[PDB]
């Protein structure tokens, strides 16, 4: 319901309820891992080898074919069983070539239950009795200072939780302009949240056809490995359109020149460095994590006056989200060729 003649100053940067949501989603992410299977019995010597594939010395395969002993239902007996792993999940311990998983020396790992999914469902945050939620209905609003048109509301609108580092996906579009947002633009340690009007459609896919393979560890314990690759061994990627992306970069240059002078050259670059899930944008697509390189998008320079971009991905199977000390998640493989469609909404 609308509320007139009112001037409440807002602040998204010293805002609460983004602090407690960041606490709540981490805590609930942990609460969806207690019924699941621990991979304590799987930290073991691996006897890995190259996958059956045409091999060139210069090129490096992204997959390894690892055989290993594994326990069974019966404590006396054990079984030789093989799986397929990525390069990023195994390291070499040191003729022969025997590996192990990377997280073995720091943390026992937890398989995600394949029954539960990772897709966003929209949360509506609701105020309890004796409080209220105000909403800035203003159009041109950098999130700091007076909002002339506020309105109370029972609950917030649909907030779908996306996990993404760069290029935040499936978000809320702006009304008419493209709005950049910062706490102090003359400072550089604070990020610049960009939100643009017309979304850029991104198409990400994995052309491999995986077969999973249930491996019993113990009584009522199932480890979902990767069986054979059926078809061509290919590299996953994402596609955006060249025209719409160059158009939205033109829009964000046009809006970034409001704070930096009109006679200013604005160029982009790729990331300076860091861990894999901050040098490039990570996301989830149908239950599998992509780390998809963005040096193709953010390469431009701008002067004061049916194609597409194929940008390549990588897939980890273990993750270390929010960088804890003893927590990881072995994401299980999923059947078939996987693809999804998302609307890029904003930037960081």
């Amino acid at each position: 319901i609308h509320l007139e003649n009112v001037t409440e100053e807002f602040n998204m940067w010293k805002n609460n309820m983004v602090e407690q949501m960041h606490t709540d989603i981490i805590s609930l992410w942990d609460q969806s891992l207690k019924p699941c299977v621990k991979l304590t019995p799987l930290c073991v010597t691996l006897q890995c080898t190259n996958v059956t594939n045409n091999i060139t010395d210069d090129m490096r395969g992204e997959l390894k074919n690892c055989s290993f002993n594994m326990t069974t239902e019966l404590r006396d007996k054990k079984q030789k069983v093989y799986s397929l792993f990525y390069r990023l999940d195994v390291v070499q311990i040191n003729s022969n070539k025997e590996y192990r998983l990377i997280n073995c020396n720091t943390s026992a790992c937890t398989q995600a239950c394949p029954k539960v999914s990772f897709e966003p469902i929209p949360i509506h945050y609701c105020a309890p009795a004796g409080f209220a939620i105000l909403k800035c209905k203003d159009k041109k609003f950098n999130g700091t200072g007076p909002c002339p048109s506020v309105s109370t509301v029972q609950c917030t609108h649909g907030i779908k939780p996306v996990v993404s580092t760069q290029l935040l996906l499936n978000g809320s579009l702006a009304e008419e302009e493209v709005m950049i947002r910062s706490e102090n633009i003359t400072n550089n340690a604070k990020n610049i949240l960009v939100q643009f009007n017309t979304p850029v459609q991104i198409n990400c896919t994995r052309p491999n056809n995986n077969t999973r393979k249930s491996i019993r560890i113990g009584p009522g314990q199932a480890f979902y490995a990767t069986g054979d690759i059926i078809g061509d061994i290919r590299q996953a990627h994402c596609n955006v359109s060249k025209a719409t992306w160059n158009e939205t970069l033109g829009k964000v240059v046009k809006q970034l020149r409001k704070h930096f002078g009109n006679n200013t050259i604005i160029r982009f670059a790729n990331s300076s460095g860091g861990d894999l899930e901050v040098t490039t944008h990570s996301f989830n697509c149908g239950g599998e994590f992509f780390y998809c390189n963005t040096s193709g998008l953010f390469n431009s320079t701008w002067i004061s006056n049916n194609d597409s971009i194929t940008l390549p991905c990588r897939i980890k199977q273990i993750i270390n989200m929010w960088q804890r000390i003893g927590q990881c998640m072995y994401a299980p493989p999923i059947q078939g060729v996987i693809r999804c469609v998302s609307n890029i909404t904003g930037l960081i």
Partner: antibody
């Protein structure tokens, strides 16, 4: 209209460098790839490899050292040198033209393709035999 | 490995290893005493000189064996057939497949 013609010794004493030649008819040596194939009696052929100008000279890695393919741009011929004839080398050998072509199965920029070869016309053969 | 099917009938001549990825097979034939001659240069593509009814199995199929289908056979079809598979996963085959022999009544 092309047809080829090989020429060689036919009688080979062992541990001796075998050499062969191949004439042309119609199409010259620069205009296409070249390839050498061998076939034993009552057997499937064995594609020894291919030669072309500008480094397109990959060999069968089974032999890989005792075989050297060559051209003749002065006289417009093709030639072959072999090294260390054993008893298995008695086979009918073939100079032939071949044509490439890209089988593309995925993204082009990600090198998800390969080039197959196919031999359209052939030579006529030289029944090389090793004997003492 | 000899297959004969009264003249005018059909014949399915298989050759080579079962597929792993995408393939570009090449079919040759060999009249007795002669040189080889190409009949099929792609999975289902033929050059000039060789007529139709010589169909080939496509390379898009995963985990099947390369076949060569002939309808309305003749005594000129009686020769030694050869396959040369080019899989996108296995390395380069510098030697051809196994010699398959056709006979006719």
């Amino acid at each position: 209209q092309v047809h080829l013609q090989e020429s060689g010794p036919g009688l080979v004493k062992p541990s001796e460098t075998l050499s062969l030649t191949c004439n042309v008819s119609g199409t010259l040596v620069r205009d296409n790839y070249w390839s050498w194939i061998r076939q034993p009696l009552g057997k499937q052929p064995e594609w020894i490899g291919y030669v072309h100008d500008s480094g397109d000279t990959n060999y069968n890695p089974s032999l890989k050292s005792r075989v050297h393919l060559s051209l003749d741009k002065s006289k417009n011929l093709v030639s072959l040198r072999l090294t260390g004839v054993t008893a298995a080398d008695s086979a009918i050998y073939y100079c032939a033209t071949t044509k490439h072509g890209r089988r593309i199965y995925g993204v082009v920029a990600f090198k998800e393709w390969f080039t197959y070869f196919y031999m359209d016309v052939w030579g006529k053969g030289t029944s090389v035999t090793v004997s003492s | 490995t000899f297959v004969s099917v009264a003249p005018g009938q059909t014949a399915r001549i298989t050759c080579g290893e079962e597929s792993l990825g995408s393939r570009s097979v090449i079919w040759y034939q060999q009249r007795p005493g002669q040189a080889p001659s190409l009949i099929i240069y792609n999975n289902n593509d033929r050059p000039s000189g060789i007529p139709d009814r010589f169909s080939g199995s496509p390379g898009s199929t995963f985990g099947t064996t390369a076949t060569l289908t002939i309808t309305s056979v003749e005594a000129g079809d009686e020769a030694d057939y050869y396959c040369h598979i080019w899989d996108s996963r296995r390395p380069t085959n510098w030697v051809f497949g196994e010699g398959t022999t056709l006979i006719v009544l």
